[PDB]
Design a protein around this ligand. Structure first.
Ligand SMILES: [K+]
Ligand SMILES: [K+]
Ligand SMILES: [K+]
Ligand SMILES: [K+]
Ligand SMILES: [K+]
Ligand SMILES: [K+]
Ligand SMILES: [K+]
Ligand SMILES: [K+]
Ligand SMILES: [K+]
Ligand SMILES: [K+]
Ligand SMILES: [K+]
Ligand SMILES: [K+]
Ligand SMILES: [K+]
Ligand SMILES: [K+]
Ligand SMILES: [K+]
Ligand SMILES: [K+]
Ligand SMILES: [K+]
Ligand SMILES: [K+]
Ligand SMILES: [K+]
Ligand SMILES: [K+]
Ligand SMILES: [Mg+2]
Ligand SMILES: [Mg+2]
Ligand SMILES: [Mg+2]
Ligand SMILES: [Mg+2]
Ligand SMILES: [Mg+2]
Ligand SMILES: [Mg+2]
Ligand SMILES: [Mg+2]
Ligand SMILES: [Mg+2]
Ligand SMILES: [Mg+2]
Ligand SMILES: [Mg+2]
Ligand SMILES: [Mg+2]
Ligand SMILES: [Mg+2]
Ligand SMILES: [Mg+2]
Ligand SMILES: [Mg+2]
Ligand SMILES: [Mg+2]
Ligand SMILES: [Mg+2]
Ligand SMILES: [Mg+2]
Ligand SMILES: [Mg+2]
Ligand SMILES: [Mg+2]
Ligand SMILES: [Mg+2]
Ligand SMILES: [Mg+2]
Ligand SMILES: [Mg+2]
Ligand SMILES: [Mg+2]
Ligand SMILES: [Mg+2]
Ligand SMILES: [Mg+2]
Ligand SMILES: [Mg+2]
Ligand SMILES: [Mg+2]
Ligand SMILES: [Mg+2]
Ligand SMILES: [Mg+2]
Ligand SMILES: [Mg+2]
Ligand SMILES: [Mg+2]
Ligand SMILES: [Mg+2]
Ligand SMILES: [Mg+2]
Ligand SMILES: [Mg+2]
Ligand SMILES: [Mg+2]
Ligand SMILES: [Mg+2]
Ligand SMILES: [Mg+2]
Ligand SMILES: [Mg+2]
Ligand SMILES: [Mg+2]
Ligand SMILES: [Mg+2]
Ligand SMILES: [Mg+2]
Ligand SMILES: [Mg+2]
Ligand SMILES: [Mg+2]
Ligand SMILES: [Mg+2]
Ligand SMILES: [Mg+2]
Ligand SMILES: [Mg+2]
Ligand SMILES: [Mg+2]
Ligand SMILES: [Mg+2]
Ligand SMILES: [Mg+2]
Ligand SMILES: [Mg+2]
Ligand SMILES: [Mg+2]
Ligand SMILES: [Mg+2]
Ligand SMILES: [Mg+2]
Ligand SMILES: [Mg+2]
Ligand SMILES: [Mg+2]
Ligand SMILES: [Mg+2]
Ligand SMILES: [Mg+2]
Ligand SMILES: [Mg+2]
Ligand SMILES: [Mg+2]
Ligand SMILES: [Mg+2]
Ligand SMILES: [Mg+2]
Ligand SMILES: [Mg+2]
Ligand SMILES: [Mg+2]
Ligand SMILES: [Mg+2]
Ligand SMILES: [Mg+2]
Ligand SMILES: [Mg+2]
Ligand SMILES: [Mg+2]
Ligand SMILES: [Mg+2]
Ligand SMILES: [Mg+2]
Ligand SMILES: [Mg+2]
Ligand SMILES: [Mg+2]
Ligand SMILES: [Mg+2]
Ligand SMILES: [Mg+2]
Ligand SMILES: [Mg+2]
Ligand SMILES: [Mg+2]
Ligand SMILES: [Mg+2]
Ligand SMILES: [Mg+2]
Ligand SMILES: [Mg+2]
Ligand SMILES: [Mg+2]
Ligand SMILES: [Mg+2]
Ligand SMILES: [Mg+2]
Ligand SMILES: [Mg+2]
Lengths: 114, 54, 123, 118, 207
RNA sequence: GAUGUCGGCUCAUCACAUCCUGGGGCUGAAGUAGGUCCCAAGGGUAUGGCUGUUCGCCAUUUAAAGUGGUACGCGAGCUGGGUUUAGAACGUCGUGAGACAGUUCGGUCCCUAUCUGCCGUGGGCGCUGGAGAACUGAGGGGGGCUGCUCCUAGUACGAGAGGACCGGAGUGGACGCAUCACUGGUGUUCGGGUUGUCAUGCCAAUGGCACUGCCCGGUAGCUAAAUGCGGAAGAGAUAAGUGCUGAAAGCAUCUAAGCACGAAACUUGCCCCGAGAUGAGUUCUCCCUGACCCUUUAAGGGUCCUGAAGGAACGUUGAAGACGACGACGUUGAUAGGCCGGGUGUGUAAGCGCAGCGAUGCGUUGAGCUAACCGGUACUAAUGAACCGUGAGGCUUAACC
RNA sequence: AAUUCCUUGUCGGGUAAGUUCCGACCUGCACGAAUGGCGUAAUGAUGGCCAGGCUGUCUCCACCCGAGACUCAGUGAAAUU
RNA sequence: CACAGGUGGUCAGGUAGAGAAUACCAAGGCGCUUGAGAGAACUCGGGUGAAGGAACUAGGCAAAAUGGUGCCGUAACUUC
RNA sequence: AGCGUCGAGUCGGCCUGCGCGGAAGAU
RNA sequence: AGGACCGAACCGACUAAUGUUGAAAAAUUAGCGGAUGACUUGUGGCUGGGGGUGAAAGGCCAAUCAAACCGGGAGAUAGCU
């Protein structure tokens, strides 16, 4: 309880930027091709955030080479090098699973001018 | 499914060896009214732990 | 998470458009194929003048699944559809010459190096 | 299994339970002492005590929340005008349950539940 | 020997190379030796230990006299560990989680969570019969429980419905992820038996 | 005066004439891979198409898809396709009623478990003064499957082609145990959207009902598809088999004396139960240190005084639970509820203001509300008592003091 | 073939695989012309077969809401023997 | 049997609706003559379900699904 | 057997007593 | 116009589950067919047992049908138990 909170607190990243569902984010992740280590960008719409301390996660959806892809990132993982908000989206819901049934014009999110 | 043989009065009694009631171990006595009551319950006259609760 | 009767899209230019898993290979009572596993398939739909025909029985490697893949940090990668790449029944090398859509790092092995190379993106 | 679960079903469905406790909460606020079954009394605390807590801060919003949960303006008025002020300095524990034997008709364990300053 | 601890809960350790290790956090306070058993007196070699604390009103006079002879404060229970021929301990000695400093794997014993009265589907992984196709009242029921006149009985050990869980379970060969002597913590990789708050016995892995 | 009969489903259990995996002899055994016979029952031992099918053929797997017994195991466990009631038709036979070891379409499967058995779970008494714990381990149960890749090594072997033993490492399938950190499901007890209608005087705001009205999300818990772990090594005694030394039988001979090796079988090792193990065991600790009477005088029966250790009961309860049971707590108190703070979820409440003819938008505002969560907190309820349990614990013999 | 025993006849189609189905062949065990023959649009809670959609039918079950089952109080059966 | 059965005629409010369907209500009438707890297996009646989608089975049995109005549009075959 | 050797038994039929293998099954 | 179409009342009874000492000696629940007709329904009437009636199932004729029910021949007869 207090023990686990203390164990979790000391592993948490301090520099996680504020983002919300509907934002376009670019996540840079470490890829390790044997000895070679490099960053790969994954850019897309945040459709879900799990706020849960060290166990926080967020789900990013993108259309990639004619295929819908979702990645669930573990927010405090060292695999995740950096997160940056590219565009702020205006949505009502916490969870944008309805976007899975939409493509192109129908899947557009209005910009949040705030 | 039903018995093939009539069970005895002996076996009836043996089954009922666990049916006996337990009397209340003891009654409590209200400090004020002196009324006997079931422990942690109010008295018949509406006392509990000395206080006229109802 | 592919089983017998599962229909897959085709992530190559072999000519097949829809294939059905008829066996999950590689063990007694093995239930499911995930990304990187080889399945037996039948071709249910194909383009005319392709490398393969409707009704052909051959192998495929699963390259995308809706169930997706877990990574060592606990992350998930999920796709919108199930897709495979057709393999020659004996040699287990790709029939096609191009790969369509993303694949995953799970394929990075000696057996599926041609798929990795041809893939437009490796997640 | 019911590990860590809260709330008694009381051999009713959810809509019946909600209506019953709304009625019983109104009865307790009105009369300040009621007799009910011991399990119902224990559940009633979880309904009535939050209403009293709500009634410590008199605002339009809170009166409407209380109205939504009681559906009785007489009860809302008594909560905000009488009980909230009466319990302003008390940190929870606005009710007490007094066990009082067994009901004649069905041997149900009974209890009085009353507001503590009645 | 091993030590007695408490299941605090589960979390994860992120490694530098981006592995998330699921861990059970075990609180291992000082285990205090309450009795040493030897071949002469007892017929076997073992230590009895206590850990934690107990309310003085809940410590009975027989319990209290046993702790008083050892010269230790009452803990929440007593547990024995058998000694190997090399090992030696004194009454009143404290044993900390530092015992596990160089131990790579441990066996963890606890009482599994209680499922109460469980059906054959849950308890024994029996297959359900048809949900439809005419099935009459026999969806999760066990099916046949024997043969016919030969043998004309049900065999002992027949898998049937009954109490499930709430029993001693050992999970073997769990990696020790961290020994934190300062905070009285052992982190082991993966799940161990029992609810949060339950007692665990941790021993160096037998295999 | 009824022993339900085919096939399937569910659940099995044994045999070994062994399908796989293990050990081995012979080979027309170079190697790889086979053949054949011996030992071996530990574990393991396909999914589909067609058909009522069992079977079979076929497709595609697998280390393998064993053979049999169990009322051709299993309908007071399920099914009811086949088959043998009554309806109807075809072919066929018959003058006909009708009929067929022909076909075809349709066509009611009851039982609340007394006893045995079995899975669980209590109560009683016992175990010799009583009590609280920790144990020992007689005995019992669980578990025991295996692929592929790499190294050894393109080495041994082979004219090439191909291609090992032995040993080592990695990673899977199936199965099992646990768990909920993660990924998810559920989440009628949380939040929101929304249709119809009724109500709260009306507006605004809310509530009821319509499957939770319909939906979208989702906390705790439970959970698998989630992720940890397991099968072993080692040891003993062996099977078939292989030997050493060695006579009977000057030789020879694994055997007669003596000695050695030898497998998933056996006994252990691992996990769980376990002293009703009446053969009722052990260790540690705690408690009780009054008086008196009668009498078939004996392990006799009262009386007054005493009431321990501890237990139970009652109450607040639990990640424990059908009930019992088991665990926590009872004011010298966090046991439950409430309350406070936080978290989580939902997604910017109401009211007011501003913009707009208006629907609505914007500000106040990531607002309001928020279950089972976390950290705290005596506000409420866990009572002073009472109850059960006693008062030094048999005889005999031995040893010691 | 609502008729064919041999028979899952044979050939073609459909399926990865089809004793059923559809199209043929004629070797009709044992069709056949008002106890009608062969066709036939429409119709059918009719028989057989295939496909799209759909799904807890199934892989393989999980959780939840209710009514019983369980406990307490009241009443109080039955077959069988 | 104070029994989820059977029994002909007449009357016909409101909102929504094509409607005497259906939902919610009015007038009016009722809560069905054992209750109280608990929140096991299993049974019954329901809700939701990852990935798959008939692999189930004698057989898609059951379930899931479709579902309104207006307009556009609609094949073989046909007794038109 | 050694019979290029040394020092008494040795060979293999027959009949018969008692044993041995042949000999795998399902709670 | 219609033994026309969709669909309540009304009339039926194709499937499934439940129930099977039932709530019920044939039902309940979810679906299902007909629904201006060879329709359906109230009241009354007529047909009588080798007889009736039957869009024909040996169906129905008072929970009874390959010959109703009640009384009688009657203590039929029973080489059977
Ligand atoms: K068998
Ligand atoms: K061999
Ligand atoms: K075996
Ligand atoms: K059967
Ligand atoms: K039987
Ligand atoms: K049954
Ligand atoms: K018996
Ligand atoms: K979880
Ligand atoms: K959850
Ligand atoms: K409303
Ligand atoms: K004992
Ligand atoms: K128990
Ligand atoms: K509290
Ligand atoms: K706002
Ligand atoms: K506002
Ligand atoms: K919030
Ligand atoms: K014929
Ligand atoms: K004729
Ligand atoms: K004609
Ligand atoms: K007659
Ligand atoms: Mg009894
Ligand atoms: Mg709780
Ligand atoms: Mg009830
Ligand atoms: Mg409702
Ligand atoms: Mg439990
Ligand atoms: Mg099954
Ligand atoms: Mg039935
Ligand atoms: Mg059923
Ligand atoms: Mg017997
Ligand atoms: Mg008989
Ligand atoms: Mg053998
Ligand atoms: Mg065996
Ligand atoms: Mg054996
Ligand atoms: Mg063994
Ligand atoms: Mg088969
Ligand atoms: Mg049989
Ligand atoms: Mg058999
Ligand atoms: Mg039977
Ligand atoms: Mg049949
Ligand atoms: Mg007939
Ligand atoms: Mg039955
Ligand atoms: Mg054993
Ligand atoms: Mg065993
Ligand atoms: Mg598994
Ligand atoms: Mg959690
Ligand atoms: Mg979720
Ligand atoms: Mg929901
Ligand atoms: Mg809601
Ligand atoms: Mg009004
Ligand atoms: Mg309004
Ligand atoms: Mg209403
Ligand atoms: Mg209503
Ligand atoms: Mg061994
Ligand atoms: Mg010799
Ligand atoms: Mg093995
Ligand atoms: Mg006290
Ligand atoms: Mg939030
Ligand atoms: Mg609102
Ligand atoms: Mg803002
Ligand atoms: Mg709060
Ligand atoms: Mg707390
Ligand atoms: Mg035939
Ligand atoms: Mg044929
Ligand atoms: Mg053919
Ligand atoms: Mg098919
Ligand atoms: Mg078929
Ligand atoms: Mg034909
Ligand atoms: Mg004819
Ligand atoms: Mg003819
Ligand atoms: Mg003629
Ligand atoms: Mg003629
Ligand atoms: Mg005709
Ligand atoms: Mg014709
Ligand atoms: Mg009773
Ligand atoms: Mg009644
Ligand atoms: Mg009635
Ligand atoms: Mg009527
Ligand atoms: Mg109306
Ligand atoms: Mg109506
Ligand atoms: Mg229930
Ligand atoms: Mg159900
Ligand atoms: Mg549903
Ligand atoms: Mg699903
Ligand atoms: Mg969902
Ligand atoms: Mg889905
Ligand atoms: Mg589909
Ligand atoms: Mg299909
Ligand atoms: Mg099938
Ligand atoms: Mg099948
Ligand atoms: Mg259907
Ligand atoms: Mg439906
Ligand atoms: Mg012999
Ligand atoms: Mg008509
Ligand atoms: Mg009729
Ligand atoms: Mg109906
Ligand atoms: Mg019609
Ligand atoms: Mg109609
Ligand atoms: Mg007839
Ligand atoms: Mg009749
Ligand atoms: Mg006659
Ligand atoms: Mg006569
Ligand atoms: Mg007579």
């Amino acid at each position: 309880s207090n023990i686990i909170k203390q164990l979790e607190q000391e592993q948490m990243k301090q520099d996680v930027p504020s983002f919300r569902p509907g934002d376009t984010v670019e996540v840079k992740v470490w890829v390790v091709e044997g000895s070679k280590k490099r960053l790969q960008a994954f850019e897309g719409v945040v459709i879900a955030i799990r706020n849960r301390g060290l166990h926080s996660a967020f789900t990013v959806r993108k259309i990639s080479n004619g295929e819908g892809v979702e990645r669930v990132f573990q927010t405090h993982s060292p695999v995740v090098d950096s997160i940056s908000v590219k565009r702020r989206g205006a949505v009502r819901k916490a969870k944008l699973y309805y976007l899975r049934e939409r493509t192109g014009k129908a899947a557009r999110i209005k910009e949040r001018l705030n | 499914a039903v018995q093939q043989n009539k069970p005895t009065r002996s076996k009836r009694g043996m089954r009922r060896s666990h049916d006996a009631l337990t009397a209340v171990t003891s009654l409590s006595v209200d400090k004020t009214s002196g009324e006997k009551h079931l422990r942690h319950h109010i008295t018949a006259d509406g006392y509990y732990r000395g206080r006229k609760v109802i | 998470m592919i089983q017998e009767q599962t229909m897959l899209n085709v992530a190559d230019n072999s000519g097949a458009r829809r294939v059905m898993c008829i066996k999950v290979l590689g063990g007694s009572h093995r239930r499911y194929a995930g990304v990187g596993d080889i399945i037996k398939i039948t071709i249910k739909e194909a383009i005319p003048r392709g490398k393969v025909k409707k009704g052909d029985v051959l192998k495929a490697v699963v390259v995308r699944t809706k169930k997706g893949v877990r990574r060592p940090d606990g992350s998930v990668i999920r796709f919108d559809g199930n897709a495979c790449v057709l393999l020659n029944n004996n040699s287990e090398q790709p029939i096609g010459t191009r790969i369509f859509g993303p694949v995953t790092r799970e394929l990075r092995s000696e057996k599926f190096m041609k798929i990795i190379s041809l893939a437009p993106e490796v997640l | 299994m019911r590990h860590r679960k809260s709330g008694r079903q009381l051999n009713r469905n959810s809509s019946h339970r909600q209506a019953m406790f709304r009625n019983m909460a109104g009865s307790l606020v009105r009369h300040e002492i009621i007799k009910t079954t011991l399990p119902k009394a224990k559940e009633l605390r979880r309904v009535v005590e939050p209403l009293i807590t709500l009634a410590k801060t008199d605002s339009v919003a809170n009166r409407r929340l209380a109205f939504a949960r009681t559906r009785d303006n007489e009860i809302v008025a008594k909560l905000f005008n009488e009980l909230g002020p009466r319990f302003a300095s008390r940190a929870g524990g606005y009710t007490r349950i007094l066990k009082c034997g067994f009901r004649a008709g069905d041997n149900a364990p009974m209890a009085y539940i009353e507001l503590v300053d009645r | 020997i091993g030590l007695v601890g408490k299941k605090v809960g589960m979390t994860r350790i992120f490694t530098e190379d981006g592995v998330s290790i699921p861990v059970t956090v075990i609180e291992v306070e000082a285990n205090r030796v309450t009795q040493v058993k030897d071949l002469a007196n007892d017929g076997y070699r073992a230590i009895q230990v206590t850990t934690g604390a107990k309310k003085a009103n809940r410590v009975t006079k027989p319990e209290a006299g046993h702790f008083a002879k050892a010269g230790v404060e009452a803990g929440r229970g007593l547990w024995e560990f058998r000694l190997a021929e090399g090992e030696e301990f004194t009454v009143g000695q404290s044993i900390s989680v530092e015992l596990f400093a160089d131990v790579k794997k441990v066996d963890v014993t606890g009482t599994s969570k209680g499922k109460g009265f469980a059906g054959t589907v849950k308890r024994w992984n029996f297959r359900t019969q048809d949900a439809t196709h005419g099935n009459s009242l026999s969806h999760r029921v066990p099916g046949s429980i024997g043969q016919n006149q030969t043998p004309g009985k049900v065999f002992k050990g027949k898998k049937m419905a009954g109490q499930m869980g709430n029993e001693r379970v050992t999970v073997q060969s769990l990696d020790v992820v961290r020994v934190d002597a300062e905070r009285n913590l052992l982190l082991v990789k993966g799940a161990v038996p029992g609810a949060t708050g339950s007692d665990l016995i941790v021993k160096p892995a037998v295999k």
